[PDB]
Amino acid sequence: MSYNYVVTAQKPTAVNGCVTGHFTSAEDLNLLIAKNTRLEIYVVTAEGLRPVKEVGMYGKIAVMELFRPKGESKDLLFILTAKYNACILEYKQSGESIDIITRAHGNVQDRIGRPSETGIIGIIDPECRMIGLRLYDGLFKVIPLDRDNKELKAFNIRLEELHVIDVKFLYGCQAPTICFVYQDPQGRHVKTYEVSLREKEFNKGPWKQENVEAEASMVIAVPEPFGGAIIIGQESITYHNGDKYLAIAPPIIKQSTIVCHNRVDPNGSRYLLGDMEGRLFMLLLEKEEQMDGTVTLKDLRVELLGETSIAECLTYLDNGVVFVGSRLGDSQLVKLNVDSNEQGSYVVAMETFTNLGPIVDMCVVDLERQGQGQLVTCSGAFKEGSLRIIRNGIGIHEHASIDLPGIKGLWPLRSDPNRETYDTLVLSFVGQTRVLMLNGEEVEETELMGFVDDQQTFFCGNVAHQQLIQITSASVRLVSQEPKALVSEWKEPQAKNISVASCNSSQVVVAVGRALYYLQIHPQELRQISHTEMEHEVACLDITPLGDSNGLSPLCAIGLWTDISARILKLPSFELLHKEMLGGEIIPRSILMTTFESSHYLLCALGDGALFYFGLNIETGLLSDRKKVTLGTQPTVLRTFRSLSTTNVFACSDRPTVIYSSNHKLVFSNVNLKEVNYMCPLNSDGYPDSLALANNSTLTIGTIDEIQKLHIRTVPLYESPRKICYQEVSQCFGVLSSRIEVQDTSGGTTALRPSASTQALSSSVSSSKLFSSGEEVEVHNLLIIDQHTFEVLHAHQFLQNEYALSLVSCKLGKDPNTYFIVGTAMVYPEEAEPKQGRIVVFQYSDGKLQTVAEKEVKGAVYSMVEFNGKLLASINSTVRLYEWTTEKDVRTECNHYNNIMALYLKTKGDFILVGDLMRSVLLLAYKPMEGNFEEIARDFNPNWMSAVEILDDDNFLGAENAFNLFVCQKDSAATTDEERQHLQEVGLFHLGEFVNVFCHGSLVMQPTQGSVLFGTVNGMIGLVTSLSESWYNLLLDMQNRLNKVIKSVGKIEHSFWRSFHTERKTEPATGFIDGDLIESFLDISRPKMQEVVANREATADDLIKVVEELTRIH
C-alpha cells in the first residue's frame, strides 16, 4: 500500500558549471550554464545575456565541453552524466523552433573501478582527436573522435598512477599528450603521457616527471604561442614546459585556496583565478619576443582585482564582462575595469542572480497572517549566507477599500485635458451608472453634466479634443470637458439597444446583436463610417491600435455566439479575414489584442473559465500557438494595465491570473486575491501607479508585486546560518549562525568584516562559568529576527569554541513561557568527537533576550525535539529525556537513556520517533514502565542518511548520500516479534538532489492527500504527497506511455535515470511518481497527446484536466 508523488517546486538554482563558445552559430558568443540536470543556453549580447534555450537532462551533468571537430560549421557539445551517460549534442535552429540533436551517445560506466577522489574529470584534446575521461582510479578511458563512433565505444588504458589530482591535454603536441598531478607517498608530482590510440598504450611523455607542491591541485594547459602547463597550488603558482620552469610564491594567495580559473585572452597571456573567499585574481603571463626566435615566457604575475561572490564558475565574456557562476551565493555579471574605483576595486557588479544557495534548513510560516504558506530558508554559506523568503503568487497591497455591491464594469477618468493623472472613477451598475470624484484619498459620488446615470455604461474613456466618451447601452454619448456639454449623440436607426462596446481613444465599434456600426470621434461629432452584419450574434469585441498607428486601430477582434469562433476583421471595411472555430458551445466571454515583444498577441477567453491564446501579425492573420490553458471556472474578463517597462494583461476570474512574459513566452501566475470580476489601471492624484478591482461587493485600489510565479525576498547575513525556528507568540525567528574570525597578532580573534552577528541592534555574550579545564575559528551566535522587518533585533554569542548545533522553540512542562532552546558543543580541532556541550534556555518575551537556564551535558547536542512536555535531546551517541522543573531547572534521570547517535530526529504526536544511528532509519516508542524508549522497528539495509521525515504513523521518508529518496514502512503481518523488527523499503526513487530538510507545510492553500516540502544543496525545493491505488496506477500508466512519446536529450531512459542507485545496488524505482514527468504531458502536441491515449474511460480531455488539478499542488 505504497503510493507517492514528487514534484519540483523550484528548479535548482545553484550553478555547477558554465562554459563559453560558439554553439548557437559560428557567428555568436554563447554562455552555457549547467544547473543540476539543467543546461541553459545564452547569447552574450550588449545589454547582457539573451536566453535562447533551457533543456532538461535525465542526469546530473558532470562534464560540459564545447569543441569543433575537423571541418565543422559551429561548436559541438559534450555532456557526461554522473550515472555515466555520454552524448555529443548539436544546436539545430532549423525553423522558428529550436532543437538539440544527439549526434552520438552511449553509457561509459565500467563494471570495474572505484570512483576517483576529485571525481569525474572529462577533457578534450586541442586537435579534437579524442575525449579523455578519468572516472575510476587506475584507469583512463579514451573515446576516439571520428565521423563514426556514434555510440562512443571507448577503451580503457591502465593508469599506473593510483591517485590523480587533475588532468589536461597539453597544447601544441605532435600527438595527444596528457598532463597530470598525482599523489603517491613522497608528495605530488607532474607527469606526461602521449596517447597512442593506434595501439591503445601511453608510451613515454614529452617531458620528465617533476615534483610539485603538497597542495597543488589545478592544471591549466596554456595554448600554442606558449605551450606547457600552469600548476596552481597553495602559496605557490608555477609554469612547466620541457626543461623550462618558472615559479612564484605571492603571499596574497597564501590564504584561501584557489578553486577555479578561466582564460581571458586566447593567447593565454591572461587568466582569471577565483578563491574560496571570492577574491578574484588576474593571472598575467609575460611574453618575451626574440627578434626571430619567436615568443618565450619571461615571468608570471598575479594582481588582486577585488571580490566577486564565491564562484564555482568563472567565464570571461566580452569587453571586461565576467559571468560568475556561484554555488554558495547568488550568481552575477561583473564588469572588470582598468582603473580601480572607490574602495579600490577593479570589479563592479552589473547583475545579480538569485540562488537559494544550499538550503541548509528552513520552515513554513503563514507570514502575513493569511492562510497561505511562506517558506523561509537558511541559505548560502560564509559571506554569501542569507535568509530567503519564498512567496507563492503575486500580491497586491490594499490602500483603500470602499464596499459597494453589484458592480458590472469599471473605467478610469481624468478631469483635465493636460495631464496623465486621473481623478474620476466610473462604476457601471446593472441598470444604472454612478460616477465618482477624487479629492485625494477621498471618494465622493456626484455625476458629470453630460453623463447619463439611469442607463448602464459599457465604456468610459478619454478620446480626442478635450473629450470624454460614455457608451451607454441606449446611445453613444459625447461630452466636451472644457465646454461641459453633449457635443452630439448617436443612436441606433431603429432605437435597438447596443450590445457590445469597443473604444480605444480615437475609434468606436459597437454591436447591436449581429449588426455592427463603425463610428468616429473626429472633432466634436460622432461620425458613422461603416456597417456589416455578422453570421451570428456578437459576444465580444476589442480594438486598440498596435504600433504603426496611434489611436486609429487598423484591425478588429471578434467573438461569435453559435459557431463559438473568434475572428480578425479590417475596420475600414469589416471584411472577414481569418476566423477560427473553437470547440464546445460555451460562448466567448472576452477577446483582446495587445503588444508585448516579438509577437503581437490576440487572445480570447471562454465562459467556463477556459482560455486559448493566439500570436498574430498585425500585418495579416495567421493562427499561432494554441493550447487550452484553463484558469478559473468563472467566465474570464481580460484587461490591459501599465506596470514596469513592459505593460501587461490581467485575467479576471474566481482564479485571478496575470499574464506576463517569460524568455519570450507569457507567464501564468496566481494573483493572491479572492475573486476579481473587473479591474482597471490608474495614475490618481491620491493613488498613483495603481489598479482598481471589484468583487461581488467591494471596490479596491493598490500596488502590484513582482512578476514571477514564486516571489523571493532576500535577507543578507554575511555569515553562515545553520538553523531556524519560528516563534509565534514573540512574532520572530531564532537563527543559529556562525562567523569566521582569525588568529590575531594579539593572538585572539578579529573581524574579517561586519555581518549579522556583529551589527545587531543589541547583543549579549555568554557569561557562563561551566568550563575551566594564522588560524581560523568559528564564533557562533543566536540571532533574533523580526518576522516583519527582518532586522536583526538581538544577537547572543556563545562561549569561545562553542558551536551551536540544534535549536528549538517550545513551551516546557507546566510553564506557559516559550523558550528558544539551544543545544551546543565544545569544539576543538584535535578531537574527533566532543565530550562537552550545554543546553541553554533563553527567553525573548518583553523587548529582550533573557538567559533562563544552562544544563551541562557530556557531549555534543546534535539534535533535540520537544517530546510530550519534556526535552528529548540527542547528546553524542546518547538520547536523554529532560524534565523542566517548576523552579525553572532542566533535569534528567541519568539511568534513563539510549544508545543512539540521532543525527536527524522527528516526532509523531504520539509516543514515537524516527532517528538515525549507525547508518539506518529507526523507529522508537516511549514506554513509561521503563521511563525509556523501545526499539519498535529498524531499516536494516544500510543508508548514509541526510534527512528524515514522518509521513504518517506507519510510513517514513528518508533521503541519502546517493541522491535517492525512500519510504520505509512497518510490516503489517505475522511473527510480530522478528519480521516486525524489520521495516521495509516500500518506495524507491533517484531524486538527483542532496536533501537537507523536509518539513510539513504547503505554499498553496487559500484532490490528493499530504504535503511535505524539502530543501536541497542545489537550492531546489521539492514537494511530496501521497496518492491512492487508482491515481498511482493511472499515473504509473501515464509514465510508461509518456516515455515512449517524449524525446529525451542524450537518449537517456527516464527509467534508468530515476532508478535508485548506490555504490552497492541498482533497483528500479517503486512507489514514486515525478510530477515533473507527469506535467510535461501538457507540453506535448495534441497529436503525440492522442498517442499516449489509446486505452474508467480514457481521453485526451478527461485527462489533460487531471494533470492540471495536479499543477495546483504547488
Partner: peptide, 14 residues
C-alpha cells in the same frame, strides 16, 4: 572533526 564534517556536508563539501 565530525561536527564540521557535518556542516561541510550540508554545504556539499566546502
Amino acid at each position: 572533526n565530525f561536527v564540521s564534517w557535518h556542516a561541510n556536508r550540508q554545504l556539499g563539501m566546502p
